[PDB]
């Protein structure tokens, strides 16, 4: 789950897809 933000965070270069569980980016 969470194919990104597993160590830091991106949400800028498409770093996120869906499973992203990082509650640090304005993803959802």
Residues found near Cd ion in the complex (CB under 5 A): 4-5, 9, 11, 16, 20, 22, 24-25, 27
17 is in an annotated binding site: no
- Burial pattern 1-20, b for ≥16 Cβ within 10 A else e, equals eeebbeeebeeeeebbeeeb
1 is in an annotated binding site: no
8 is in an annotated binding site: no
Pair of tokens at residue 12:
């800028």
Q: How far apart are CA 11 and CA 27, in angstroms?
A: 7
Tell me how far, at minimum, the Cβ of 14 lies from Cd ion, in Å: 9
Residues annotated within the binding site are 4-5, 9, 11, 16, 20, 22, 25, 27
């Amino acid at each position: 789950p969470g194919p990104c933000c597993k160590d830091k965070c991106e949400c800028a270069e498409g770093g996120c897809k869906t499973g992203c569980k990082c509650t640090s980016c304005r993803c959802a």
